[PDB]
Design a protein around this ligand. Structure first.
Ligand SMILES: C=C(NCc1c(COP(=O)(O)O)cnc(C)c1O)C(=O)O
Ligand SMILES: C=C(NCc1c(COP(=O)(O)O)cnc(C)c1O)C(=O)O
Ligand SMILES: [Cs+]
Ligand SMILES: [Cs+]
Ligand SMILES: [Cs+]
Ligand SMILES: [Cs+]
Ligand SMILES: [Cs+]
Lengths: 249, 399, 399, 249
């Protein structure tokens, strides 16, 4: 059957644009202000929101996101606060997926977390330190609770692993990272029709537009955190510029 | 092969302990190290190269010394010390490092990185890279640079760049996080010389295979000096390299008790400890499914110990498996128990152990009381205490 | 042996090297020690105890290691390092100490004293006294307490008392003066564990006999690895114990060049050196007739070296004899040369040597350039550099 | 036939008393002052003067002598200054022997030093770090230049070595130290009629008289040096008191 995120990408493709995919960590700079920021993203034209779960040992986040997740953990952020963020985003007419390191999901219970996320209106899970090789429980929870499953590929991924990682993904494949980003997207396009989101330290309209030529979704995270730290108005302005960037004409 | 994990690195079944809880961005280089190790572990020319450096450069075998003057504190049991403290660089770490540095050269890698807590793994790596002409970068928590400064100075004399890590607890776990970051950004040219029996496959198995020599030698030596297999073999347990090293040769000796001793810091009831098996629970951490100190949400609880080497909230997956199976017991030893033992060994036998190693000595003394007169206990004396002399001198009011 | 002195301690008959240049007040105890050594050196129980401790406690044999990365810096000669740095306590000193401390106990002495410069002899003496349960007191020059502080802390952790000596140069010569004053007063209960191949008979011969093991192992090991005897065997020379220990087994091999390297400090023409053979003359000092740095009335001239272990204006009498006979050549090595060699050994082979041993390595590099490609040169690596890491890092600007 | 100091001990033995033997080191507090002090000892009643040769590593000297000899050496004292002091002593009517460590004698040359000591009017050599076992060159030089040879015995000396040391000595034997001084003099008397000098850190009239009851000479050094440090008139007064002490016993 159709993936949960299928209609958003179908719709974006029909209007000659990429989907704008926006990341914010739950609890930064505190729980209420982060919910207000995530709502703002919905109101300012984010097609998909990645609700980040702060983690004590976030090996793959750059310093902007890492400082923000640290502040969130100092403020007492909980995993259930990410489920609340998903609820508020759904209520505001948005579409939320969660991005998390795997151990918090194991600690919660994989089946339980998929169930509760689905209940809150969550559409999927982005798993930056879960590879399909270790995802058996997650694949079963994902099919049971109709949640998409977004694995990452990298420019270094072998032919064999890229194909297995694409085949295991539903919703979109995250092409994490220069011609590396278009070359990696083109390798996913050679084996499958799944939408490909591209993260590339995007911080301007110009860069989102560049990526929207070849990718189905433009992923922005660091620049949204930086904008939010300055203030909610700055976040709105930036998200606006990025929303204009993803549309091609 | 018998105690090995499956090709995905799992102990105890296809979804048990170990595995590879890593990002896809690290899988190309992890597969490359796995293939390289699978090839070289059965090459006699590789094992010759390793054996030759073990003998002539590192001075193996390490001796087994019967520490007769400890006996009265150990219930009149007989404590035998496996003297890894006499290895080049002053710990068991050099065994693993020699294997991996040989492997990195076989792979055509020009740059080596490593994490370190006590600085013994960092010194060993720096040492091997100097010997083999490899560039070396060592990551160390800023709290550890301050309390193991002798080892920082050594690494630098050996030509290594030492990077002080200021994130999180500024101890071993945070050095590891930084090392993995370096590796994903520098995979083309860089080998990660992982320092303990933990991490994603292949590291738990490879580290252990390079530390097996300790228990192989000890099993022969204790039969020679005591006339029988021991009643117990014991070790301290950080991530688990020295313990798995000495334990492995005895796993199929069903009369031989195996006991691992973990750092309990101020005590397990204080929240300032690293007693991963005593107070932790299963989870995914630093590339393996194993035990770790974690809160209700799955956030890592920061470890504390007087020992920089045992100050780690996780443990290797093979130990998790051996725990679950009932083959090894894991027990807490506090800072104070460790320091009493440290002092006792200095005064009684004239051996200054590493503070890590003194946790094992403390545990053996207790085990001795439990087992009684004449019991034969082999203790891995993982390292010497030169790095800890200032800390120990302060503890004992000697300046 | 053919190389032994007469019963008075004289080498080479009428040139008269060695002997006993001490007060009558010391003779009862000197005669007592001499006679106990003659009795115990042929006692199987003593030899067995010494052997057991060398193997199981100290970790003998030390390996011999072909440092192939040094070759291009040594005229393409082949430098083999005799790794006394891997012994328990980290130098050769432990060889002589195990023998003498066992002997102290056989004599029924209840207190042991010693002098130390680098603190290696101190730490070794303290180590053996912990092992055997003897009161230990170590005399150490006040300037050496400051520049070898790691070793002062080790000594005190081992249960030894350390007395800082503030007279004269506050270096090794002055520590020796104080320890002789102690022995005079405390002769009936105190054994003096003399740390180098000097002093009155029986110390030069006895210390050499306990250090002979180095050269016996080295002679076997080089034949096994290289297929023949070396072209040269070299070592650094303070009072002369590590050098005489490695040289002795080669004395009757006429194709084996023997070279001792002595500390030249700022340079031999500067008056801040310890180049006893290069710039001294025959005289009586510290119980022997040997060479020393002395002025025109025979007042002792104060030595200087960056190395605390070679900072001694005297040298043992058996070396004086070997020099006179033309069997051994003695050559000066400056602070700078030694330090360049220190850093080289660090970067090329991953071995942090003692600053003492670095003088020998420096000389070996020069001798390699003389002897040329393929020449085989055994170097005594007498100790490791833990104690010198502060000094060396300061020398190389690594702070 | 007879030793050089033999007629001094005879004259004491006929005046029913012991010889006062006084030590000063050459060059303390400088060379001219040390000679003025040694001459003053002759005038103040010392039967024998021990002229000390300052040595850089004086194993046997206590703190007072050690520090005076160190100061003498910082002031540039040479070995020839000792021979100059001997000559001044002999011209004043005194009877001088030299106390020296052995290396200064080796460096000078043993024969040449004996020759020059005798030419200065010296009567003997006290050799605190030369045992008879090493004394071949000195015995030969002693017989030829007609110098007494004063060796030391100790409480710890074995009977064999005591006999050998006494036999090797001409002039007197220095018994260096409980009831341990009289016991050592007793053991020398049992095998030889040679005079025995006793040094015992004597400070006073009473102590000197105690020693004169069993010994042929009373040796004072430390206390003379301590007196000179205060001043030359204090040396005279003290030496006067000690002269009275040796006539008591
Ligand atoms: C973590 C580090 N050392 C741990 C260590 C340990 C504990 O680590 P294991 O990997 O459990 O053996 C035991 N003994 C000594 C002497 C050690 O140095 C390090 O030096 O990097
Ligand atoms: C003087 C002292 N050591 C001298 C020393 C020497 C020189 O002493 P020899 O007796 O010349 O071997 C060489 N190498 C090392 C590592 C040393 O520590 C001491 O430890 O007391
Ligand atoms: Cs060995
Ligand atoms: Cs642990
Ligand atoms: Cs304390
Ligand atoms: Cs002791
Ligand atoms: Cs010397």
């Amino acid at each position: 059957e159709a993936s949960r995120l299928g209609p958003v990408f179908d719709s974006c493709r029909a209007n000659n644009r990429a989907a704008l995919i926006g990341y914010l960590p739950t609890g930064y700079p505190d729980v209420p202000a982060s919910v207000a920021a995530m709502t703002a993203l919905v109101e300012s034209g984010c097609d998909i929101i990645e609700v980040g779960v702060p983690y004590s040992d976030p090996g793959m986040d750059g310093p902007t996101i890492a400082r923000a997740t640290e502040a969130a953990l100092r403020g007492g952020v909980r995993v259930r606060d990410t489920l609340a963020a998903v609820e508020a985003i759904s209520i505001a007419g948005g579409r939320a997926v969660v991005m998390t390191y795997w151990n918090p999901v194991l600690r919660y219970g994989v089946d339980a977390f998929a169930r509760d996320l689905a209940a809150a209106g969550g559409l999927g899970l982005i798993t930056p330190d879960l590879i399909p090789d270790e995802a058996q429980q997650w694949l079963a929870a994902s099919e049971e609770h109709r949640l998409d499953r977004i694995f990452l590929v990298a420019p270094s991924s072998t032919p064999e692993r890229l194909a297995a990682t694409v085949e295991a993904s539903r919703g979109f494949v995250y092409a994490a990272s220069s011609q590396a980003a278009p070359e990696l997207v083109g390798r996913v396009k050679a084996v499958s029709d799944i939408p490909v989101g591209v993260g590339l330290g995007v911080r301007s309209r110009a860069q989102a537009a560049q990526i929207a030529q070849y990718a189905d979704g433009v992923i922005v995270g660091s620049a949204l955190v930086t904008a939010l730290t300055e203030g909610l108005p700055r976040l709105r302005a930036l998200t606006g510029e990025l929303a204009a960037g993803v549309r091609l004409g | 092969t018998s105690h090995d994990p499956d090709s995905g690195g799992h102990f105890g079944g296809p979804s048990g302990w170990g595995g590879r809880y890593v990002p896809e961005a690290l899988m190309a280089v992890i597969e490359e190290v796995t293939a390289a190790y699978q090839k070289e572990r059965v090459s006699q020319d590789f094992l010759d190269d390793l054996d030759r450096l073990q003998a002539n450069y590192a001075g193996r075998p390490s001796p087994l010394y019967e520490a007769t003057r400890l006996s009265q504190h150990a219930g009149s049991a007989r404590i035998f010390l496996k003297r890894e403290d006499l290895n080049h660089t002053g710990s068991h770490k050099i065994n693993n490092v020699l294997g991996q540095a040989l492997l990195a050269r076989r792979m055509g890698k020009t740059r080596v990185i490593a994490e370190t807590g006590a600085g013994q793994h960092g010194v060993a790596t720096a040492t091997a890279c100097a010997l083999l002409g490899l560039d070396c970068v060592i990551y160390m928590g800023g709290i550890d640079t301050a309390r193991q400064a002798l080892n920082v100075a050594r690494m630098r004399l050996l030509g290594a760049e030492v990077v002080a890590v200021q994130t999180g607890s500024k101890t071993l776990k945070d050095a590891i996080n930084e090392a993995f970051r370096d590796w994903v950004a520098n995979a083309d040219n860089t080998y990660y010389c992982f320092g303990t029996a933990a991490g994603p496959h292949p590291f738990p198995t490879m580290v252990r295979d390079f530390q097996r020599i300790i228990g192989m030698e000890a099993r022969v030596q204790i039969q020679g000096q005591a006339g029988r297999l021991p009643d117990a073999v014991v070790a301290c347990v950080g991530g688990g390299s020295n313990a798995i090293g000495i334990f492995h040769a005895f796993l199929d000796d069903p009369g031989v008790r195996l006991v691992g001793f973990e750092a309990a810091g101020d005590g397990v009831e204080t929240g300032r400890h690293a007693a991963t098996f005593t107070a932790g629970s299963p989870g995914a951490f630093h590339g393996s499914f194993s035990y770790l100190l974690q809160d209700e949400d799955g956030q890592t609880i920061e470890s504390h110990s007087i020992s920089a080497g045992l100050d780690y909230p996780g443990v290797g997956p093979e130990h998790a498996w051996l725990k679950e199976a009932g083959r090894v017991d894991y027990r807490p030893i506090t800072d104070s128990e460790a320091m009493d033992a440290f002092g006792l060994l200095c005064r009684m036998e004239g051996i200054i152990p590493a503070i890590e190693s003194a946790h094992a000595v403390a545990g053996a003394l207790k085990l001795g009381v439990e087992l009684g007169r004449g019991a034969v206990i082999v203790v891995n004396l993982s390292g010497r205490g030169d790095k800890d002399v200032e800390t120990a001198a302060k503890w004992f009011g000697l300046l």
